[PDB]
């Protein structure tokens, strides 16, 4: 019954794809090509943080806009004062293939994870003075790409083993389990209430997941290569993803389809990364080209082209007040613009 | 700045130096990755997720990185690996007629797509071809025939196991500016670690010539 | 975590000691050391203080050229000489872990002390107050004025309270204005602004009795105040 199966799965993928026709009326181009555009964005490098000494993969924010934290290759986690570029601790690491990092939300915890298949989770409030490992997260068979924490005791977890995790820091167990990908998660996003997450992985397919009950609600299909990035709206009814078809497509939750595309004719390198503007107007994506484009979501236009790395842009973000952004590099420097 | 704030720049000095003194640690080592089939054994030239073994021979200072239980797509985190040392891939001519596609082509495609990556255009590779003794006494059985069809040579040791080295390093393109170093791995010696040794120190000298600025 | 002081004891005018401190229960290095004494029914004044990595030392002016301070990470002990002893430095001294970066809570452990019998400009913190009448259950302010504006460009105000019960060590309430320490309750609430500070106790009970102390770390010198004991 295999060609069976095949065949009502085959009718149910074009009459979702049928429903997605129906259910678009007009282009997102079509009714904001009246808007008024932003002609230029000049955004200056306000600081330079040195100190690592081999290629940055990851960097995360915390919430009062004014701490992150750093992985590079060289073993190193490292908090950041960014606004007097004071480096607050420097974290060695068991493992130095690192390939992403993480600060909690209440600014306790930093969390880092890579080719050692464990995400470890470190304690930066301490009685005594060092930076204590809370614990050591095991379960996944491959390396983890991506991790964020939902708060102090749920964090969430992206593997190259084509599953997405949800763990008990309390306990160091599996809470609940994501399958359905074939192909290795690279990123993650959760949604701003928490609730829900996005993930995309090699299959150039992103699916969107409910964290409280398990299942996935979403899949969508219209890169033509692996996703390497993902990234929320601030209102949490769309998504932005990035592939190494020098593409970034902006997908709708509820339209359950592709709404714009973000690619140019001289782009041939891939995205590394992306993120968000605080109002959602721009969106900012890292590419292999040592450079860093500003898009306008709304016209799909480029507003600007952050330029002052020698190495390939892996990691960037946006404070949560948007007052500035934090690009790292392979050239082992992270830089702060405004 | 207040009284805080420039003890604050101090602790920021302090472990700017910490970090600078274990950059230089860690620079003055080489790193190595081991490579391969599962068959082969890279278990033989030593004795969930990555496995570093590190070792000592005469003063200088090894990082090997086994990344054989690491099942997913290699393009997606060969690229941490640009700057190592040297690569040691492992062979065995015992699996010339086995088939899980015979053995030894996936060894030849694995070779292929290793040696002509992006990230490894001037990096040097230890081909280390394994299972001498059991090669030795299967090619007087079983001969070159089932692995090459195209061989047309005789039956011995010593001519079988200098084709498929001459297939191996013929795999190589761009031989101007990478170098391919070929061992037959010995069981009761240890000359296998004498021969990275070499290698690493031809590498070492080709970085210190580029460094000075004269190549 | 625990400092445990060494030496004092009874000494002639003009003689020598050394005072120790072992250090056990934490990471020692990472930590900045200051001496603050306390005269036997007075307040308590900063002797001398020296950083992580022993790069800056800062002394008292009336201590300064006579003592010497110093640190042996790798035995995790603090040392504090003491040369041509006066009849004004008979005290109990105390040994302050300090850490400093941003977020940090320094003055957060104190020593139990030793005390020291010899025979026989700095901005000024006032505490008017002295001697408040208080009962179980009530809300008492406690206030605090400086000579200075403690509040710099960096946007913080530098203003330490502590609580020294009786027969124990001075232990940190809030460390810097409206910033409340680990392991004290969600009573004490510090207010203020420019000059005037106040420490505000909502709910009191029969562990809040002690003198109230009130301490700057805008510059050196660090200067306290005359405590405001409360009594039932």
């Known amino acids: 019954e295999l060609d069976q199966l095949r065949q009502e799965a085959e009718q149910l993928k074009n009459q979702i794809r049928d429903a997605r026709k129906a259910c678009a009326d007009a282009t997102l181009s079509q009714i904001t090509n009246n808007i008024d555009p932003v002609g230029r964005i000049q955004m200056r490098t306000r600081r330079t943080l040195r100190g690592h000494l081999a290629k940055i993969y990851a960097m995360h924010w915390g919430t009062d806009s004014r701490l992150l934290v750093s992985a590079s290759q060289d073993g190193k986690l490292i908090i950041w004062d960014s606004y007097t570029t004071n480096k607050v601790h420097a974290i060695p690491l068991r493992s130095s293939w690192v390939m992403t990092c993480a600060y909690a939300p209440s600014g306790n915890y930093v969390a880092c994870g890579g080719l050692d298949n464990i995400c470890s989770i470190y304690n930066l409030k301490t009685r005594e003075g060092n930076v204590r490992v809370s614990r050591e997260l095991a379960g996944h068979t491959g390396y983890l790409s991506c991790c964020r924490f939902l708060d102090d005791n749920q964090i969430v977890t992206s593997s190259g083993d084509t599953t997405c995790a949800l763990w008990d820091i309390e306990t160091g167990q599996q809470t609940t389990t994501f399958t359905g990908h074939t192909g290795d998660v690279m990123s993650l996003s959760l949604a701003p209430d928490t609730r829900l997450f996005v993930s995309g992985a090699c299959d150039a397919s992103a699916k969107l997941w409910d964290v409280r009950e398990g299942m996935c609600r979403q899949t969508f299909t219209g890169h033509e290569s692996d996703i390497n990035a993902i990234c929320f709206f601030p209102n949490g009814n769309a998504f932005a993803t990035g592939s190494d078809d020098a593409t970034c497509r902006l997908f709708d939750l509820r339209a359950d389809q592709e709404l714009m595309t973000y690619s140019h004719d001289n782009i041939i390198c891939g995205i590394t990364s992306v993120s968000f503007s605080k109002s959602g107007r721009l969106l900012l994506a890292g590419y292999d080209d040592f450079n860093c484009n500003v898009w306008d979501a709304l016209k799909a236009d480029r507003a600007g082209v952050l330029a002052g790395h020698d190495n390939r842009v892996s990691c960037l973000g946006v404070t949560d007040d948007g007052m500035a952004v934090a690009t790292g590099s392979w050239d082992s420097f992270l830089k702060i613009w405004n | 700045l207040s009284a805080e704030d420039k003890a604050a720049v101090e602790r920021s000095k302090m472990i700017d130096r910490n970090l600078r003194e274990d950059g230089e640690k860690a620079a003055r080592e080489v790193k190595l990755l081991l490579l391969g089939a599962g068959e082969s054994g890279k278990n033989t030239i030593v004795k969930t997720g990555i496995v570093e073994t590190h070792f000592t021979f005469k003063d200088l200072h090894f990082k090997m990185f086994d990344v054989g239980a690491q099942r997913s797509e290699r393009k997606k985190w060969i690229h941490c690996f640009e700057g190592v040392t040297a690569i040691i891939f492992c062979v065995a001519l015992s699996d010339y007629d086995l088939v899980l596609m015979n053995r030894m082509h996936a060894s030849m495609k694995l070779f292929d797509s290793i040696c002509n990556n992006k990230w490894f255009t001037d990096t040097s590779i230890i081909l280390f071809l394994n299972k001498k003794d059991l090669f030795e006494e299967k090619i007087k059985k079983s001969p070159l025939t089932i692995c090459y069809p195209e061989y047309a040579g005789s039956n011995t040791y010593e001519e079988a196991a200098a084709y498929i080295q001459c297939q191996f390093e013929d795999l190589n393109k761009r031989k101007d500016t990478k170098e391919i170093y070929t061992h037959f791995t010995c069981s009761t010696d240890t000359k296998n670690v004498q021969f990275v040794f070499d290698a690493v120190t031809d590498v070492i000298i080709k970085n210190n010539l580029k460094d000075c600025g004269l190549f | 975590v625990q400092l445990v002081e060494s030496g004092g004891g009874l000494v002639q005018p003009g003689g020598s000691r050394k005072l120790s401190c072992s250090a056990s229960?934490?990471?020692?290095?990472?930590?900045?050391m200051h001496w603050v004494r306390q005269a036997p029914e007075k307040g308590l004044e900063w002797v001398a203080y020296?950083?992580?990595?022993?790069?800056?030392?800062y002394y008292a002016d009336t201590v300064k050229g006579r003592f010497t301070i110093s640190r042996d990470d790798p035995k995790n002990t603090l040392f504090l000489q003491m040369t041509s002893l006066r009849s004004e430095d008979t005290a109990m001294y105390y040994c302050?872990?300090?850490?400093?970066?941003?977020?940090?809570?320094?003055?957060?452990?104190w020593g139990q002390g030793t005390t020291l019998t010899v025979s026989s400009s700095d901005i000024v913190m006032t505490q008017a107050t002295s001697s408040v009448p208080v009962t179980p259950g009530e809300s008492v302010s406690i206030s605090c004025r400086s000579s200075?504006?403690?509040?710099?460009?960096?946007?913080?105000?530098?203003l330490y309270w502590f609580l020294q019960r009786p027969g124990q060590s001075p232990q940190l309430l809030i460390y810097?204005?409206?910033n409340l320490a680990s392991g004290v309750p969600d009573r004490f609430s510090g207010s203020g602004s420019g000059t005037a500070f106040t420490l505000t106790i909502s709910r009191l009970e029969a562990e809040d009795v002690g003198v109230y102390y009130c301490?700057?770390?805008?510059?050196?010198?660090?200067?306290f105040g005359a405590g405001t004991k409360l009594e039932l």
């Open positions: 302050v872990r300090s850490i400093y970066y941003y977020g940090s809570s320094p003055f957060d452990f």
């Open positions: 229960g934490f990471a020692f290095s990472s930590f900045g």
């Open positions: 020296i950083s992580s990595g022993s790069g800056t030392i």
């Open positions: 200075k504006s403690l509040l710099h460009s960096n946007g913080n105000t530098y």
């Open positions: 810097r204005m409206s």
């Open positions: 301490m700057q770390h805008l510059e050196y010198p660090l200067t």
